[PDB]
Amino acid sequence: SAPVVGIIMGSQSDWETMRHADALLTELEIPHETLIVSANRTPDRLADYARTAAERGLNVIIAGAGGAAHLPGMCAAWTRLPVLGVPVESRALKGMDSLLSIVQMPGGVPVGTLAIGASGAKNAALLAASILALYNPALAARLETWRALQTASVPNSPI
Template sequence: MKIAIFFGSISDKGIMKNATEILKIFNVNYKCYIISAHRIPEILINTIKKVESEKTDLIIAGAGLSAHLPGIISSRTIIPVIGVPIYSKNGLLGGIDSLFSIIQMPKDVPIAAVGINNSYNAALFSIHILSMKYPEIKKKLIKFRINIKERLLNEIEQDL
């Protein structure tokens, strides 16, 4: 099992790091690529072909501002893409511009999307998808969810 994580700028690294942390918990292999869809599209296209040849299961793609990276990736592969809209200090809309760009994909170019800056949920959603194919991931995910529930119940009891 393998996930490819794309983001368009080195400045997105801090946001996308949250995805890698959850993937490490589940021992899911991943590789990160920093490639601008607008500035070096030919490298992006070649990298998508490489990712496909490596039998990658899913792609997580984070992008800010116009946020075309997830859509361009989805248009070039049948590997499912989860888009992460990223807030950019250069933008005026607080990341909503990126969110709209990712969720308003045209018919026939699907992308799943998570909340602004929420690469953690993108990775966790990837884990849910992988759990349908890989029984060992499913077992870990069930245990993970039970642990979350127990932790929350403990916090509630401590507050009472």
Template sequence: MHKVAIIMGSKNDERIAKKAIEVLDDAGVSWELRVLSAHRQPEELREYVKNSDADVFITIAGLSAALPGVVASLTEKPVIGVPVSAKLGGLDALLSIVQMPSGVPVACVGIDNGANAAHLALRVLRAGSRRP
């Protein structure tokens, strides 16, 4: 069982995923990394999210950054979005991630900040382990 699922919208986002992986490895938390585009692979993404046993999803996406919102629409589990500085300095992705509609929450960290996404995932996991 992987505690954290990291989904990148593109292989180009690997440098950001590596930052998250380093933090998770240092904490001894298991993870799984996938490249699944919300636009190019919607059915594969849906299947992966629906069948994942991860407790938290970290989603890394640039441009329109649809990936975090799509993942959040498919699960009740926490979703953390990492905007990528692909265009417009990452502001397009940042705004896309933070402006989710009511009922489809996505936590958002800073642009290209995969490490902070992992730190947030660790806090979510710790909070969940304290439940009665």
């Protein structure tokens, strides 16, 4: 029941993208919390959230943001937990700005970066699942099933 994964996003507009991470974790029955945290607008909220994540029992944090997208990197700056970043596609630069500000983190402060957009959000949840699966046999089995279903469900020909 207690969340083991935290999904945080820069703003409400990021939900259209990050909901894909939420849906996937629920599908795999991975207890989690979904919140809005802005690195630039709510810096103290982020500091407190990241600093206390491990204490609260969180094992992985999935962070998504658009524009300069400081959220993922700054979250990683305050927590020892694995942080996965999702560049949110936002208008002018199609998430290219977000991608670079998330993936180009300096040595010492990693952010496992996923694809720009919905696919990245979905994959951040799957990656978080693969991490948790390392020490949760039941989840590992459900993940195996999920991957097997994906592979088996791909059509052989276009419609």
